[PDB]
Design an enzyme around this catalytic site. Structure first.
Site, PDB file in Angstrom:
ATOM      1  N   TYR A  60      37.574  28.858  40.825  1.00  0.00           N
ATOM      2  CA  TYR A  60      36.582  28.148  41.629  1.00  0.00           C
ATOM      3  C   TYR A  60      35.988  26.959  40.882  1.00  0.00           C
ATOM      4  CZ  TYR A  60      32.767  27.972  45.146  1.00  0.00           C
ATOM      5  OH  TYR A  60      31.901  27.603  46.150  1.00  0.00           O
ATOM      6  N   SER A 130      40.432  33.623  37.005  1.00  0.00           N
ATOM      7  CA  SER A 130      39.283  33.974  37.837  1.00  0.00           C
ATOM      8  C   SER A 130      39.689  34.147  39.300  1.00  0.00           C
ATOM      9  CB  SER A 130      38.180  32.923  37.673  1.00  0.00           C
ATOM     10  OG  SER A 130      36.900  33.472  37.958  1.00  0.00           O
ATOM     11  N   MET A 131      39.197  33.286  40.204  1.00  0.00           N
ATOM     12  CA  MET A 131      39.637  33.377  41.596  1.00  0.00           C
ATOM     13  C   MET A 131      41.135  33.143  41.725  1.00  0.00           C
ATOM     14  SD  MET A 131      36.953  31.785  44.312  1.00  0.00           S
ATOM     15  CE  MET A 131      35.291  32.386  44.542  1.00  0.00           C
ATOM     16  N   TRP A 155      38.928  37.492  39.393  1.00  0.00           N
ATOM     17  CA  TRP A 155      37.809  37.658  40.309  1.00  0.00           C
ATOM     18  C   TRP A 155      38.362  37.913  41.705  1.00  0.00           C
ATOM     19  CZ3 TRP A 155      35.601  36.222  44.805  1.00  0.00           C
ATOM     20  CH2 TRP A 155      34.219  36.393  44.977  1.00  0.00           C
ATOM     21  N   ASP A 176      32.251  38.795  29.863  1.00  0.00           N
ATOM     22  CA  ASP A 176      32.308  38.057  31.121  1.00  0.00           C
ATOM     23  C   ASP A 176      31.134  38.447  32.017  1.00  0.00           C
ATOM     24  OD1 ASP A 176      33.085  36.799  33.578  1.00  0.00           O
ATOM     25  OD2 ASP A 176      35.203  37.075  33.070  1.00  0.00           O
ATOM     26  N   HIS A 208      33.778  34.384  30.139  1.00  0.00           N
ATOM     27  CA  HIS A 208      34.607  34.129  31.310  1.00  0.00           C
ATOM     28  C   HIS A 208      35.530  32.927  31.147  1.00  0.00           C
ATOM     29  CE1 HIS A 208      35.753  34.355  35.508  1.00  0.00           C
ATOM     30  NE2 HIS A 208      35.458  33.075  35.662  1.00  0.00           N
TER      31      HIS A 208
END
Ligand SMILES: [Cl-]
Length: 254
Positions: A60, A130-131, A155, A176, A208
């Site tokens: 993101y 992540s995303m 994520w 994170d 993170h």
């Protein structure tokens, strides 16, 4: 023998070095020319041969620059690697999954001949931060023919990845606070089938954004995972098994 074997017998030093032994070139995939994603950069080995192909998604508000170091490092070990931009920096995991899929198709069908002729389209992998790591999990559950999946500090709001059959290595970051391992990386790894090849590597003293920085452990175990499962290269098993780092889990020996 193994016809997919490339490069030397591995060592810890060779996997931890800033680049592997293959010199790499770059080819642009422009945003308007790329169907289904926002373009990106294809890293490929100059040495003429066929290699597995890998698509990597940022997270993101992220752009391909946040995963650039890792696309190039993985390619320098003998892979064709595209680091994509997403349609928008706000796209959600399941959208990033479709964009990862379009990027694989792009390398196979729409890149130049120098790129396409260096790809074994039967041997593909996806990764993501992540995303984008959530997108990796989603695509893996949709495409059981993928050889490997590597979510990096992933994520996702869905924690049930029991449908994933692709050999999957999850990398978490102990500190994170954006995708806490307790509510993302760990339930992801645990819900993957006990019967597949899988591993969970939790970085020690990492935040993170550890995947966005050149990282000796991330490069080492990402390349080892890809070598083992995209190339069937069992010279790399002894680096995955029993494994090393705050925490390591796996279904070793595989
Ligand atoms: Cl170009």
């Amino acid at each position: 023998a193994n016809p997919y074997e490339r490069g030397p017998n591995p060592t810890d030093a060779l996997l931890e070095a800033r680049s592997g032994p293959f010199s790499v070139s770059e080819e642009r995939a422009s945003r308007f020319g790329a169907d289904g994603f926002g373009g990106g950069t294809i890293y490929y080995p100059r040495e003429n041969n066929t290699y597995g192909a890998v698509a990597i998604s940022p997270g993101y508000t992220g752009t391909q620059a946040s995963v650039a170091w890792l696309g190039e490092r993985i390619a320098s070990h003998g892979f064709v690697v595209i680091t994509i931009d997403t349609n928008t920096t706000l796209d959600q995991p399941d959208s990033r999954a479709r964009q990862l899929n379009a990027a694989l198709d792009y390398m196979i069908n729409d890149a130049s001949s120098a790129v396409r002729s260096r790809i074994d389209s039967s041997r593909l992998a996806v990764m993501g931060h992540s995303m984008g790591g959530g997108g990796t999990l989603r695509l893996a559950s949709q495409r059981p023919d993928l050889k490997a999946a590597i979510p990096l500090t992933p994520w996702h709001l869905n924690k049930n990845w029991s449908s994933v059959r692709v050999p999957t290595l999850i990398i978490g970051a102990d500190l994170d606070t954006i995708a806490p391992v307790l509510t993302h990386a760990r339930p992801f790894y645990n819900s993957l089938p006990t019967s597949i090849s899988k591993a969970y590597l939790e970085l020690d003293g990492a935040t993170h954004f550890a995947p966005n920085i050149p990282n000796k452990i991330i490069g080492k175990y990402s390349v080892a995972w890809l070598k083992r499962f995209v190339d069937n290269d069992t010279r790399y098993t002894q680096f995955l098994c029993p494994g090393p780092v705050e925490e390591y889990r796996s279904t070793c020996p595989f």
